[PDB]
Amino acid sequence: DKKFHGILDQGEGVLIIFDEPPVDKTYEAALETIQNMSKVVDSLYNKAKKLT
Amino acid sequence: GSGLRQYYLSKIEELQLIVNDKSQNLRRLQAQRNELNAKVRL
Amino acid sequence: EFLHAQEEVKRIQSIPLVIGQFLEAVDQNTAIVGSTTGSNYYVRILSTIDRELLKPNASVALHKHSNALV
Amino acid sequence: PPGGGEQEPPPPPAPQDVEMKEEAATGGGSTGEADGKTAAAAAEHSQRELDTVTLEDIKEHVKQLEKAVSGKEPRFVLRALRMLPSTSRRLNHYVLYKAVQGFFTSNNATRDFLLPFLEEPMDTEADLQFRPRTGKAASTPLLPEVEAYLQLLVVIFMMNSKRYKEAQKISDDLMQKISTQNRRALDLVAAKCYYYHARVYEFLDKLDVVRSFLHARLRTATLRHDADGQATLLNLLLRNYLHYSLYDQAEKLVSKSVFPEQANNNEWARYLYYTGRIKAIQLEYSEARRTMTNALRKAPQHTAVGFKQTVHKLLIVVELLLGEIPDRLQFRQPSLKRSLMPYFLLTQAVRTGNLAKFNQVLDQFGEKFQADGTYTLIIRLRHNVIKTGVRMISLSYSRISLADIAQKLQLDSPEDAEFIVAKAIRDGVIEASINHEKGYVQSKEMIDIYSTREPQLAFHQRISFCLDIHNMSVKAMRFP
Amino acid sequence: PKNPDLRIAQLRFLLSLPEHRGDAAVRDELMAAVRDNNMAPYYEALCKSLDWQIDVDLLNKMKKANEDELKRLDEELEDAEKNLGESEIRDAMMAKAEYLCRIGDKEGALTAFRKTYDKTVALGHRLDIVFYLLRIGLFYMDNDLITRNTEKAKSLIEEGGDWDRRNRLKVYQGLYCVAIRDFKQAAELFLDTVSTFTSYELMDYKTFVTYTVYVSMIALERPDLREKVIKGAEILEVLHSLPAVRQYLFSLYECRYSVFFQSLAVVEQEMKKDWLFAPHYRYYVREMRIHAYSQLLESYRSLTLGYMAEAFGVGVEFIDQELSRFIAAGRLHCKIDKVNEIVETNRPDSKNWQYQETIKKGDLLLNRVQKLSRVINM
Amino acid sequence: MSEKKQPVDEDNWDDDNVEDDFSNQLRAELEKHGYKMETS
Amino acid sequence: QNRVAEFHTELERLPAKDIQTNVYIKHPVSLEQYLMEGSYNKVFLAKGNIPAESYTFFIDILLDTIRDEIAGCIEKAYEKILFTEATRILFFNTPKKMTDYAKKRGWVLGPNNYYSFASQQQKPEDTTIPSTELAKQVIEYARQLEMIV
Amino acid sequence: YLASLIRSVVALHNLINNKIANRDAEKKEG
């Protein structure tokens, strides 16, 4: 339930605690611009197809 | 002809091709200068 | 030279400036403003002004004598 | 006769109008861009050259009796074209022979008379300099004849019309070769004939005369002119070295002519496919299947064109030679529904452990398999039957015993287990290592792809690719 | 009339395809065959269904007198043109085309509904007509032509919410919008449960909820699905009524992993005697096994399957061959172990996953601008 | 070469991890796609 | 002679000759169908089927080309084995085959084991050796991007 | 790598917008 940043081990009986990285933001916004650039080439693709 | 003309006639080919080539390259650079010169004058 | 040309236009402001408000635009680089002198004019605009700043009926500056968008 | 009589006047004038004018505009416009347009390396009639790929395959096949296309050829081959007064005579003849088609009868040249009609391009001060014009007018003897798919006794006159067109190579190479680059038009003409002269030499024996011709025709490339002429002949060179079943293929590898840098996204797409089958037969698979995948996605932009049927067939064959399991009909076609059905069963028995069922289907559907040209699967597919199983286990289990991987594979015993665990590492299947203290097969995980310089290796090509498009754009922009 | 006509096509959808299950099927097919003036679809079962009863003469007179009850007035109208209005009157085809769909077939429906289509240009007339094309689109289950007029009513007839054709925008999330594209059209479009009552044409509510709870737990694993299914109140009353819904919900959230095979089989036993009998778990069970596993393999990065022998179910060898199916074909991201008896999991990093994703989209757009570079410029 | 040397003694194209992932519930979600905006 | 590329380009020319008849080609391709999966010294269990004269000069090379990569694979991650695993499984209980492995290779049978030696490395890295040449790419990036193209 | 991927598409707009304006001003002049 994300109350806690941890992980457990059955073969060890051991609770392990790690921290949280705020890093994954540049790559997330990177690929969404590629989704927008997919459509503007499609908007140019029929533009050349409708007339050379 | 094959030994005394063909050395020149095959060689003037590529001398024609580059002059054929960069004339297209020149008039591209010609019109771009006329855009900025009409922009600065105005 | 074009960036030297943009800077040398900027003597036209010089702050004895009067204040109007933008009203409408006819075409490329020519518009209509409503002055705070009561009357209403048909003026010319500088090529320097970024065109994103227009139509809130924005407050604009005008020349005294020649009365252009500055 | 009352039913078929009134259906006669509408069929002539539709080829007599638009099939009349298209090459009349093309033969005028390319001529004005042969005389003018010194940089006619890429004419806009090169797209009309691409139109003539599509045009006469569907527009006209026969010379259209009731006098529609039968009068085009005596009109368009009667071209002397002396000067502006004696070309405007011929510019009137584009109009005057239209009354000869409509009001009068046309000149019926049933597959034979076009070869003596090639004297009107000699009669009364004709032009030899317009080797594009006469080169298209050397294609036009083929264009109703070959494209009607007769393949019947005019094959020899197909050949003799091409020998006149091979004599137009002679007129290119000997008669006033002054800087017109017409070979890059003639090579596509040398393609068009030698797609069917290829088929002609499939209706007859071998091509060692043309092999001596094609090597010499390839020889004049790379010195005189080099764009798409080297490329299209190289597929014509490769396809029957492949069609003949000799050694034939290391000659292709040492044929260091692979790189005319582009082929307008059509010839280069299948060029990867012809050499993809070549690299597949010498057991290299992962380098083969990545240019197999590259050839499928490069120019598929039609609907079941026929060799798209073949590259989609051969692609997961070699991927069933490594042992990853993609199967087939996720892009299915109406011309594929019949041609999937033996290939249907072929890939399911890879994942299952039944081989007599596989040997049933191979015995059942071997004639279709032998029709496809994939004889040599079974000498190397029984290989991958147990290789697909062992990779699936090694992908599943992180640390597997030898003593357990056997009995799951109905393999009876912990020796028959690592009778598959000593070449798979050598073939590049699994990273895993084996200790002779436990006999356990454990692999590790890759983490350093972002921790070490993997990404900026891959980026430097793609940075260099995107700047080339910006360079190709600006150099090809300001033609006004 | 046509609002209880939902039952007949559904029971006809039920009978013949289970060949062994046909005793109680024919015991109430006789209610659907000779009663309610049902005429067509069993005469086309003449070589499909059973031997027969004498259904010929008793009902061909009942189709005749009821056609003769209707066919005189519909084709003539001319009655109130005696006082010359528009030379017509509007009481004829808008009132009797509904019989031409209920008892008359789609052919008598298609020529009547388009005839009353151009008769009246109101959306409120185009309300009930298009909804009859869609109700008969389930009846004769010609499930491709009636995929069209939904979108043709989505385009022009749908202008908003604001209780309306929302009456049969209960023809826009359980007949046409989520069928076999179903991964997220159950997700995004099932957000509203906002009413309760069963009116005279709301014949299916309580068993309809059993759908939208069996498809509820599918959209989102734990970014607070638990409010809309457990903290929700209208869903709380029916699970207070139905224990098979309630225990199956409260097995999954409350993490009783052992009782899943009990709670799945009770759902499975409900899926033994259900009408849906042609293409089945295009989401469910061994995705619901991986839905059970994705939350179980989470929080444990070093797990042993000896703990799986009682926490989730029995068959140590059965779990082992089950995870071998799931890992090896691109699902359930972990790495199982042999004789150490470990279930070890591995995850992508916060950057290894995105570098794997940007290398996929970058190749697609590069291949795209390969092609458009050479379409133009020779 | 090297015997791997030892001492001891349908048509479901990843549409199978789609189809063997698919067998007991959704067939009245095949044109049960549209009835949901007057009550729910 | 490890010409498996030359093998599978040879079979292209004789489709039914190599399979349906011709035991002198059917046996080397049933050799190769053995040579796919796990049957390479099961090959030596099928040694005693020569249809022609002796064929000894190329099963001796086939003796050679198997037993040396056998020695190559035991230099690899197959770490160490006792003498009797080299006896029953390689083949041929003890002739001067023990002189074959002790002299062509090392693997001296000392006290009851064939002994492996060190086959590892150090793995050094600098990653600023590219810092001269990665700077060369970055200067090249702004080179072409600034030039009037 | 993002910034190049858009800059190439931006320069590709200027191709088609020039190639439409080139030949369509030509084909109406002739």
Q: Is G109 helix (H, G, I), strand (E, B) or coil?
A: strand
- Going by C-alpha positions, the residue among D362, D318, D383, D357 that lies closest to residue G32 is D383
**In chain G, what residues touch F9 (CB-CB under 8 Å)?**
none
Q: Is E255 left (phi over 0), alpha (psi -120 to 50) or beta?
A: left
Three-state secondary structure call for residue C25: strand
Among residues E136, E206, E227, E205, the alpha carbon closest in space to that of E175 is found at E136
User: Residue E158: what residue type?
Assistant: E
The CA distance from B7 to E29, in Å, is 98
Chain F contacts in chain G segment 89-108 (CB below 8 A): 89-90
Contact between chains at D42 and E377 (C-beta distance less than 8 A):
yes
Distance CA E42, CA E25 (A): 14
- Pairing state between β C18-27 and A14-17: unpaired
Give chain A's largest Cα–Cα span.
69
Q: How far is H16 from chain A (nearest CA, A)?
A: 7
The number of beta carbons lying within 10 Å of the beta carbon of residue D109 is: 20
Residue among D184, D196, D278, D275 nearest D234 (CA)? D275
**In chain E, whose CA is at the least distance from the CA of H19?**
E376
Instruction: Give the dihedral of Cα atoms D200, D205, D207, D208; nearest 10 deg.
Output: -160
User: Looking at the partner chain, which of H6, H13, H23 has a beta carbon nearest the beta carbon of A44?
Assistant: H13
**DSSP secondary-structure letter at A15?**
E
Cβ of residue E365 closer than 8 Å to a chain H Cβ: yes
Q: φ, ψ for residue E195 (rounded to 5)?
A: 180, 175
Q: What is the rounded CA–CA span in Å between residue H14 and residue D477?
A: 8
User: How far is it, in rounded angstroms, from Cα G106 to Cα G80?
Assistant: 12
Which helix (DSSP H) or strand (DSSP E) does residue E196 occupy?
none
Resolution (A): 3.3
Residue showing tokens 């060029």? D271
Strand order in the sheet with D433-434: D399-401, D440-442, D433-434
Per DSSP, G84 falls in state T
The one-character DSSP state at E56 is S
Q: Do F31 and E143 touch (CB under 8 A)?
A: yes
How far apart are alpha carbons D156 and D323 in whole angstroms?
50
Among G26, E131, E370, D413, residue whose Cα is nearest residue F35: E131
- How far apart CA D331 and CA G67 sit, in angstroms, is 48
**Alpha-carbon gap, residue D289 to B5, rounded angstroms:** 51
- List of residues 6+ apart from E365 with CB closer than 8 A: A34, A37, A38, A41, H5
Of residues E26, E27, E58, E28, the one with CA closest to residue E45: E26
Contacts of D361 in chain F (CB under 8 A): none
Query: What's the angle, vertex CA E57, arms to CA E55 and CA E62, rounded to 5?
Result: 90
Closest CA to E93 of E111, E67, E69: E111
Torsion angle, CA of E313/E317/E319/E320, rounded to 10 degrees? Answer: 160
How far H2 CA lies from chain D's nearest CA (Å)?
9
Measured between alpha carbons, how far is E268 from E273 in angstroms, rounded to an integer? 9
- Token pair of G2 as six digits: 């490890």
Q: Which of D38, D177, D479 sits opposite B20 (nearest CB)?
A: D38
Give the C-alpha separation, D287 to C5, whole Å. 58
- State the Cα angle at D111 between D106 and D117, rounded to 5°: 65
Chains A and H touch, contact meaning at least 3 pairs of CB atoms under 8 angstroms apart? yes
The rounded distance, in Å, linking the Cα atoms of D71 and D90 is 15
Classify C19 as helix, strand or coil.
strand
Residue F22 with chain E: CB contacts under 8 Å: 280-284
C-alpha closest to that of C67 among C23, C28, C47, C37: C37
Q: Using CB atoms, list chains with 3+ pairs below 8 Å to chain E.
A: A, D, F, H
Most G CBs within 10 A among D243, D436, D444, hence the mutation to make, goes to D436
Hey, is the C-beta of D476 within 8 angstroms of any chain H C-beta?
yes
Query: Which chains sit next to G, with 3 or more Cβ pairs under 8 A?
Result: D, F
Specify the residue for token string 């000659």: D251
Q: What is the spatial distance between Cα E127 and Cα E157, in angstroms, rounded to a whole number?
A: 8
* Cβ <8 Å between F9 and D330: no
Q: Experimental method for this entry?
A: cryo-EM
Report the candidate in G66, D419, D440 with the shortest Cα–Cα distance to residue F9: D419
**Is D181 within 8 Å of D141 (Cβ atoms)?**
no
Q: Which helix (H) or strand (E) holds E344?
A: strand E343-344
**Residues with Cβ within 8 Å of residue D240, at least 6 apart in sequence:** D198, D201, D207
Of D396, D440, D445, the CB nearest to E324: D396
**Which pairs with CB-CB distance under 8 Å and at least 24 residues apart come from A33-41?**
A33/H2, A33/H6, A34/E358, A34/E361, A34/E362, A34/E365, A34/H5, A35/E361, A37/E365, A37/H5, A37/H6, A37/H9, A38/E361, A38/E364, A38/E365, A38/E368, A40/H9, A41/E365, A41/E368, A41/E369, A41/E372, A41/H9, A41/H12
Q: Kindly report the three-state secondary structure assignment for every residue of chain D.
A: CHHHHCCCCCCCHHHHHHHHHHHHHHHHHHHHHHHCCCCCCCCCHHHHHHHHHHHHHHCCCCCCCCCCCCCHHHHHCCCCCCCHHHHHHHHHHHHHHHHHHHCCCCCCCCCCCCCHHHHCCCCCCCCCCCHHHHHHHHHCCCCCCHHHCCCCCCHHHHHHHHHHHHHHHHHHHCCCCCCCCCHHHHHHHHHHHHHHHHHHHHHCCCCHHHHHHHHHHHHCECCCECCCHHHHHHHHHHHHHHHCCCCCCHHHHHCCCCCCCCCCCCHHHHHHHHHHHHHHHCCCCHHHHHHHHHHHCCCCCCCCCCCHHHHHHHHHHHHCCCCCCCCCCCCCCCCCHHHHHHHHHHCHHHHCCCCHHHHHHHHHCHHHHHHHCCHHHHHHHHHHHHHHHHHHHHHHECEEEHHHHHHHCCCCCHHHHCCCCCCCCCCCCCCCEECCCCCEEECCCCCHHHHCCCHHHHHHHHHHHHHHHHHHHHHCCCCC
Identify which of D317, D303, D306, D237 has the alpha carbon closest to the alpha carbon of residue D274: D237
β-pair partners for E2: none
**Residue H22 in 3-state DSSP?**
helix
Residue E21: both structure tokens together: 């299950």
Pick from B17, B25, B28: which is nearest to D179 by CB?
A: B17
Dist CA C49 CA C33 (whole Å): 15
Q: E343-344 and E335-336 as β-strands: parallel, antiparallel, unpaired?
A: antiparallel
- In eight-state DSSP terms, residue E324 is H
Determine the straight-line distance between the first and last CA of chain H, rounded to whole angstroms. Answer: 44
Dist CA E154 CA G63 (whole Å): 77
What is the greatest pairwise CA distance in chain G? 79
Distance from the Cα of A24 to chain E's closest Cα (Å) equals 6
Structure tokens at E67: 């056609």
Neighbouring C-beta atoms of residue D282, cutoff 10 Å? 17
Residue type, A29: A
Cβ-defined contact of D327 to F13 (cutoff 8 Å) = yes
Scanning the structure block, which residue is given the tokens 């003449």?
Answer: E46
Residue D37 burial (CB count, 10 A): 15
Judge whether D349 and D361 are in contact, CB under 8 Å: yes
Specify the length of chain C in residues: 70
**Which residue intervals of chain G are DSSP H helices?**
4-10, 23-34, 42-45, 56-75, 85-88, 97-104, 130-146
d(CA C32, CA C22): 7
User: How many whole angstroms separate alpha carbon H15 and alpha carbon D474?
Assistant: 8
Question: How many other C-beta atoms are found inside a 10 Å radius of the C-beta of residue D270?
Answer: 21
CB E213 within 8 A of CB E240: no
Q: Label residue E30 exposed, middle or buried (CB < 10 Å: 0-12, 13-18, 19+).
A: exposed
C-alpha dist (Å) from residue D335 to D81, D296, D434: 49, 17, 49
Contact partners of B by the rule of 3+ C-beta pairs under 8 A?
Answer: C, D
**E229: DSSP letter:** I
Please give the biggest Cα pair distance in chain B: 60
Torsion angles phi and psi, residue D433, rounded to 5: -120, 160
User: E305-331: buried (b, 16+ CB within 10 Å) or exposed (e) per residue?
Assistant: beebeeebbeeeeebbebbbbbbbbeb
Cross-chain CB nearest to H4 (options D466, D473, D479): D466
Q: At G109, phi and psi to the nearest 5?
A: -70, 95
> Nearest CA of chain D to the CA of E351: how many Å?
7
Chain H residue at shortest CA distance from D468:
H8
- Residues of F in Cβ contact (< 8 Å) with G89: 5-7
Specify the 3-state DSSP secondary structure of C60.
Answer: strand
Interface test with G, best of D285, D377, D378, D379 (most G CBs within 10 A): D379
Q: Chain B residue closest to C8 (CA)? A: B40
Going by DSSP bridges, is the β-strand pair D440-442/D433-434 parallel, antiparallel, or unpaired? antiparallel
Structure tokens given for G26: 């059917």
Burial E353-375 (b: 16+ CB within 10 A, else e): ebbebbeebbeebbebbeebbbb
Q: Please give the backbone phi and psi of residue D11, each rounded to the nearest 5 degrees, phi first.
A: -65, -35
Name the residue facing F7 among G40, G66, G85 (closest C-beta). Answer: G85
Tokens of D291: 């240019």
Q: Provide the residue type at D378 as one letter.
A: I
| Calpha distance C8→E100 (Å, rounded) | 84
Angle at A12 between CA A9 and CA A16, to 5 degrees: 50
Question: Helices (DSSP H) in chain E: which residue ranges?
Answer: 6-12, 23-33, 57-60, 62-74, 93-96, 99-102, 106-113, 123-139, 148-155, 206-214, 226, 234-241, 243-252, 260-270, 285-297, 308-311, 316-327, 352-375
d(CA D306, CA D475): 37
β-strand pairing of C30-35 with C18-27: antiparallel
Q: Find all residues with CB under 8 Å of D265, minimum gap 6, and list them.
A: D298, D299, E370, E371, E374, E375
Spatial distance between the Cα atoms of D375 and E272, rounded to a whole number of angstroms? 48
How far, in Å, CA of E180 to CA of A10, rounded?
40
Residues forming beta bridges with residue E315, ordered by sequence position: none
Beta-bridged to residue D468, according to DSSP, are none
**D383 closest CA partner among D423, D434, D433:** D423
Tally of helices (H runs) and strands (E runs) in chain A: 1, 2
- DSSP characters over E70-138: HHHHHTT--STTSS-SSSS-SSSHHHHTTHHHHTS-HHHHHHHHTTTTTT---HHHHHHHHHHHHHHHH
Query: Which residue type sits at D182?
Result: N
Structure tokens at D103: 């009001």
How far is the alpha carbon of H29 from chain A, nearest alpha carbon, in Å?
A: 18
Q: Can you give the C-alpha Rg of chain B in angstroms?
A: 18
Q: What span, in angstroms and rounded, lies between the C-alpha atoms of D382 and D350?
A: 9
Which residues pair with residue D221 across a beta bridge? D225
d(CA H22, CA G61): 72
**From the candidates F17, F18, F22, F40, which should be mutated to test the interface with E, based on the most E CB atoms within 10 A?**
F40
User: How many beta-carbon pairs below 8 A join chains A and H?
Assistant: 19
Provide the token pair at D370.
């032998």
- Residue H6 sits at the chain E interface (C-beta within 8 Å): no
Kindly list the partner chains of chain H, i.e. chains with 3 or more CB atom pairs below 8 Å: A, D, E
- Picking from E303, E342, E369, the nearest residue to A41 by CB comes out as E369
Please report how the helices D229-243 and D208-219 are oriented relative to each other, as an axis angle in degrees rounded to 10. Answer: 150
CA gap E8, D315 in Å, rounded: 50
R_g of chain C computed on alpha carbons: 12
Which H helix or E strand runs over B23? helix B11-41
Instruction: Write the residue in A9, A24, A28 that is nearest to E302 by C-beta.
Output: A9
Where b means 16+ CB within 10 Å and e means fewer, D203-236 reads eeeebeebeeebeebbebbeebbebbbbbbbbbb
CB atoms A44 and H20 under 8 Å = no
C-alpha distances (whole Å) from G113 to each of D73, G69, G70, G84 are: 91, 20, 17, 9
β-pairing, A6-9 with D433-434?
unpaired
CB contact under 8 A, D419 and F6: yes
Interface test with F, best of G73, G82, G84, G88 (most F CBs within 10 A): G73
> What residues of chain B, 1 to 40, have a C-beta less than 8 Å from chain C?
36, 39-40
Closest in E300, E350, E361 to A8, CB measured: E300
Q: CA E315, CA E321: separation in Å to the nearest integer? A: 10
Subunits that touch chain A (at least 3 Cβ pairs < 8 angstroms)? E, H
Q: Give CA–CA dist E13/E36, Å, rounded.
A: 18
> By the 8 A CB rule, do D21 and D70 touch?
no
